[PDB]
Write a protein that binds this ligand. Sequence first.
Ligand SMILES: Nc1ncnc2c1ncn2[C@@H]1O[C@H](COP(=O)(O)OP(=O)(O)OP(=O)(O)O)[C@@H](O)[C@H]1O
Ligand SMILES: Nc1ncnc2c1ncn2[C@@H]1O[C@H](COP(=O)(O)OP(=O)(O)O)[C@@H](O)[C@H]1O
Ligand SMILES: [Mg+2]
Ligand SMILES: [Mg+2]
Lengths: 465, 469, 504, 52, 187
Amino acid sequence: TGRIVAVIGAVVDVQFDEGLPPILNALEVQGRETRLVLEVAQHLGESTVRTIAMDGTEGLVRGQKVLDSGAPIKIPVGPETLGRIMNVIGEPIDERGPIKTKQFAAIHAEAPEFMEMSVEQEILVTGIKVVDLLAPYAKGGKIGLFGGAGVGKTVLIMELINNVAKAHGGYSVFAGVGERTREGNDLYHEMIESGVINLKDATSKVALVYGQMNEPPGARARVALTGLTVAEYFRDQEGQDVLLFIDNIFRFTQAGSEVSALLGRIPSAVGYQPTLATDMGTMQERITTTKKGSITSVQAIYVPADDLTDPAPATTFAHLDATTVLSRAIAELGIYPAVDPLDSTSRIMDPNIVGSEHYDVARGVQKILQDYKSLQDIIAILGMDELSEEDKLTVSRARKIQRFLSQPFQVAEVFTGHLGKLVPLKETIKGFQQILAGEYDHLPEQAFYMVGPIEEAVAKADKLA
Amino acid sequence: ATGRIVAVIGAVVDVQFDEGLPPILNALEVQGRETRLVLEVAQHLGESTVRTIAMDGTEGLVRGQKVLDSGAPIKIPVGPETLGRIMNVIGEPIDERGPIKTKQFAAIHAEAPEFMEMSVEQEILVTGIKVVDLLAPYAKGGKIGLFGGAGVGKTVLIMELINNVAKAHGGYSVFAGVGERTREGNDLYHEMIESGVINLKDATSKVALVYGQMNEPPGARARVALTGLTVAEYFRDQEGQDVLLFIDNIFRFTQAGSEVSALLGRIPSAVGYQPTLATDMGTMQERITTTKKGSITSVQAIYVPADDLTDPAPATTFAHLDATTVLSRAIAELGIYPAVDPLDSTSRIMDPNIVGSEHYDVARGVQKILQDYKSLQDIIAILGMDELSEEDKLTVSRARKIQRFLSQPFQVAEVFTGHLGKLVPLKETIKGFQQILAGEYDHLPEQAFYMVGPIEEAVAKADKLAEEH
Amino acid sequence: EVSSILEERILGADTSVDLEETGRVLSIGDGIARVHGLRNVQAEEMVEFSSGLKGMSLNLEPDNVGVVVFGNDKLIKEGDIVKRTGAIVDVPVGEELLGRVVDALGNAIDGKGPIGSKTRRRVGLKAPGIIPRISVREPMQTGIKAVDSLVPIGRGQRELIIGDRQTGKTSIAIDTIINQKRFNDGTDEKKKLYCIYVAIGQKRSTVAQLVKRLTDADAMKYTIVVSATASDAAPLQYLAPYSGCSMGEYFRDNGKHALIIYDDLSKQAVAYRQMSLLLRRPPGREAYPGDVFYLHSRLLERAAKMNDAFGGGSLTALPVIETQAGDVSAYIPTNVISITDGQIFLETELFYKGIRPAINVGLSVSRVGSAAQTRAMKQVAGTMKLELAQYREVAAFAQFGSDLDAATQQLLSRGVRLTELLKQGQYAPMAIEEQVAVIYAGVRGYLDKLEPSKITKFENAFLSHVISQHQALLGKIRADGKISEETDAKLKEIVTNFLAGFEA
Amino acid sequence: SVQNMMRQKEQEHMIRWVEKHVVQSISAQQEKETIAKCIADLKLLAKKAQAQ
Amino acid sequence: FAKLVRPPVQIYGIEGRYATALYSAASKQNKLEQVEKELLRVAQILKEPKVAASIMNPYVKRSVKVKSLSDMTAKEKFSPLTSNLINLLAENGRLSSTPGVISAFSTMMSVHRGEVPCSVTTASPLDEATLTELKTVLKSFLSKGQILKLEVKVDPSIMGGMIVRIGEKYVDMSAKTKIQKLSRAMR
Ligand SMILES: Nc1ncnc2c1ncn2[C@@H]1O[C@H](COP(=O)(O)OP(=O)(O)OP(=O)(O)O)[C@@H](O)[C@H]1O
Ligand SMILES: Nc1ncnc2c1ncn2[C@@H]1O[C@H](COP(=O)(O)OP(=O)(O)O)[C@@H](O)[C@H]1O
Ligand SMILES: [Mg+2]
Ligand SMILES: [Mg+2]
């Protein structure tokens, strides 16, 4: 046991006698109503450790009694965690009874070794036509999701959960790092009304970890570790192809530079911590493709003060492999999903990774979508008919391409009434290889709006008139 | 109860007692000097050791001088006899005319009046300045602020309101000068004898004066403003008269506390001020109020450091002021004097239920044509003046006549100008500006309104320029 | 009978003896006492000195304890006796506070009499979780034609009023208190609203002018005002935001509705920074401590929309934030922006160009969206929001434009006339049924021939007409909630009858 | 507004007389001090039996 | 490292670190009373003008101030573990704070039989029957089998009452019952 000597804010100091616990352990205060977990961070000498709290600190008397677990924070893990909501210490917070499982795991765990990594790049297919063609997803890589509210982001989250559990058979974890309570309640009920979570049986496809915004600054930084332990169970024990959602990554960085300033350390550049490059290192290197399975991560990125070279969105950018941006100017055009095709980049887009068939198809799409972007200004200012006859087809074809990128989702079958289509990879490359050559140009525009493959396009030209 | 001096660093003297500890904010008399040196207690440090701040210099102090205690804070003399006298921080007279002989002594450290001792009524106090009475009217019993940088006219504009307001006023008046040039406390003692406000021969004077200037140690530029509004609290409370109060400067109350701070043991805040910045400011500015026992009009000059109103010392006084008169160097370098910014000055009584609906739609009619003149200058820089249309060649020429008509020749600035002192009444200021807006003076050039009084002299000056062609 | 009530109190007083857990004072300076002893104090526990002041112990250190002082430290000498009370800070709460002026600790400062509240509540409680909440659907009516049209507020949303000095931030939050009088004297129990106003560091004469403004409009019989002024001590401007949510959570816990206004939150982060740097805590950016995000988050997360199993209550929070030179990228203007839902951005340029209230609708958002508007207001304002947004694209062609297309001349013609409908005088809050009629007159096309200077005179003439001569139509949009096909034709000949003979 | 305002003027002037007049009356009651010690300890005899 | 016994007071400072490290070595080997009789005589043999000089005088050396003290503690009475303590205080330059370590050790050894004495501050000293009655009710309050000590102070500022402290308890029956007459005003 130990005793509390000093209570200053959200920093408690504990005095032990014999069993001095190492760093990154977890203590537990005796005599209080709810669990208050302290995490050891420094050995201060004369048998005294420096702990950061994880809940409210008031009501603590100098000289109480504090036990020791002898291990780090251990959470309930398993396959029966699918469809539940937990905080950073594994407790359930939806009043549906205690989670019961066989084994536990610790959140502070080392990276995989050098002889276990994958030696080759490999594309993850998710079914969407705009994602898997122009900005494809590597297996194990980190993905950055630009865009916020009012663009249609929370549908794209709920649909990538559904398609990987269909074409690949791998579940997902959602980790809310310092997220609002009002917006972390609507995502609970939006997933219920779309089937990906289920209150009646064991066909759920996600596990929710919610460390909300009104919690102490030590408890908002470990949530992205608790929500990575669960994602490591479905790779190390079963060998699935897991996904991982963090929303967002800036509230993991910013919650780090408030523990490192409550602990009395000199700040680095503009206000961050000295250790900005290892806390991003000792988290995002556990997200990798081992020999058993993989973990892929889609992360939301908020840039402060529109500065792309601020050290919080500059440390993160060295880890990403592909970025997709949700433009609001395509949402007022009618296209869903509202993914910009020109301002998305991929690192694995390469003739020696995805082959030459994927390459020269997806290269020509972004070139033709630039010529319509340059010719749309002469038409708006000067007029229409002055341009050549070779340019009138590029105006007509690029309005066929940017509507063939639309696709009806399976998560929206109740509302918009259409059928949700999941397109494999070999249909999307075959489709755009024919639109470029003028092979299906005589058909009108609305045959291409909101279809599946290229086969269902010509079956919709017959119903017009 | 005697005590010894154990440390001297700068202006902060440490004093160790043995049997009787005096409380915080007291007065300690250093025995052994030929002059009087008073120490003010600021902190406790344990084992009977206080830490003080010195009112005078600290040269010639030795470790072991026996220090007495007073049992009370700095009690200055106060009463009717202090009128027409200059006095020190601790109450000594420095006019060299003898001792101030009165019956009432009053400490400078006292509380603020409660919530049910406030007054609520509003008025309008007319001055005679055209920019002030039109767009940002002042008020009886209301706190007024004069902003602006260095060298734009804060001391002259506060010299103008002693010229107009203080001689037509019934009750008394107090001038506290805090941290300004010692020359300018002599051009006030010699511009108030020849106007008969200070009288050196009998008992009919109407102005007291309290002076702590910029040659004093920094423990003495932060207790003079508390000594100004202690004499001005006697007239409001123990008597019932209407008091005025002029304070220049008041930025030197904040700055003089940011110098003794780091030796008292405090971590600095933002750009270099003390951590207790907005608490001792708000402890002085809650005694300058209108209660149910009197009324204190108060005009204050506020230095803005290097033309930045986002500095933490001027940008926290805004919560304590009713009427702000922001001066500007971008107007003063045109020749428009007084350089008052019209699109940055406010008041709490610009209200069509208080100033009437005719004054209200004239004030907003002036600011709307000046702000629309600002957005037109961005076009003339690329296009030019002549390529504009004929409809907005007129709203420029109406705006330029409104800029120049606001400038008025002051009275106390005769030695700068040579021009004469004008004083336009309130009913004429509105009627002058209705006629430039409606278009009744489109046949005159711009120069006919520069440095004039009422609108009558704007056409008399127009013909006199014509004949010299 | 003045002698009898004084003799009554002193026999009714309790003079009983107790024990204590005292401890002497080590070093008092600048409002931070160091006390040796007090071996069984909890964190953030209220103690009280020998003179009469009270103190809240923030630092529990090994050899001493750091206790801030609720007053002035000239009454605290070294060697005093610091007794223990034994309880965390608690405020009186209930129905009896309605129509009173209180400080940060629940005492009465208006001098009417003491509070008769029988209950008591802590200030350090937690927010409700994810389960007891439900999505926001009911409208909170402000009464400003630009707020309810383009940036609506639901009953449980947090909306930030951000802007510079002297641009009507206090005035937007002072007619929202006045506008709820029309429901607060009626019969419908689930449409009443209760308002609380917290003043943090303003002068006493300003609060004495604002109570009289709310006394004149008969709106101080359902409003509480919590005043921690500028002269009061540095920790009393820290408790006063948390002493108002504890009075706005008694109405949320008991099935009622509420509203709270923090005026302003940028003077709480300053009164807390002074307490930190005098207790020797490690500084950070702009000398703020490491937990100023944790100071504002656990105050705004207490605003919630409860569900029917817990009562159906609500709490709506409007914080005011003062920027400096319009830079919202500072430290505290970026903490409170990322916590709340949407902002209302009042500029200073539009205030002098004639647009009053000077709400910029280019930068103002609300992320509850259109799900907090009624069915009548939603139908007309959905096109107005699209019409105004097409105008702001082409506002830069107005200064020199006559050689443009007739569609572009039309887009300028509707944008100017929709702007004149949005201007509004002070202390005149409208009704939603009168608001939807004025917008319906403009968005249809019934004003493109009237001169742009007459749009204000036409509106004040038209509103006084339909109150007296068409009262039975503004009871079939108030009670219906939507605007049907029968009312669409009935409103159609009304604005055609008035526009025909108007100019007289 | 005259009958209730002026009542508060003598409500405060009532207590203004008493609290300066108590200390001049109890200063000579040293014969009451010999029972003030003898009544204190019997409450302490009542008090030390509570924890024991 | 090895563990060390905790004192029942646990004071802090640079003088408490040396009164704890001796209490963790003299509670071992059962020598807590032998050091206390030695320490109350080393306080006497330091404050002589031959020996009080040239220990605070900084211009001698460190080592020759040890040798002038290593034989002084060796010849007279002492060769316990406490001779290393004076040898350790002179190495660390902490020989000035030797009355601070000694005065801390007496109260740390007091609490092994002591009671943290009282304070009755009312008036002039009264008769014997009032003193023996309070000394025989406060004996009923300790409940620890320890013979309580007590001090009496004279303070006439309290009108007719008395304040009593028992350790850290502080009952109160004094002139603060006149300050409780704000219920006639604040109500
Ligand atoms: N709708 C309006 N139309 C015209 N004038 C207004 C309007 N609303 C407010 N004002 C005026 O603006 C002035 C200042 O407004 P207000 O005090 O509300 O701004 P503020 O920024 O909240 O003040 P502070 O900077 O002290 O917080 C007041 O004198 C008021 O008369
Ligand atoms: N009536 C006036 N109008 C415009 N400028 C003036 C007037 N009187 C003085 N000034 C200018 O203001 C400058 C500073 O004057 P003063 O008010 O004494 O200094 P400060 O405002 O810096 O205290 C002088 O150089 C003078 O030219
Ligand atoms: Mg000057
Ligand atoms: Mg305001």
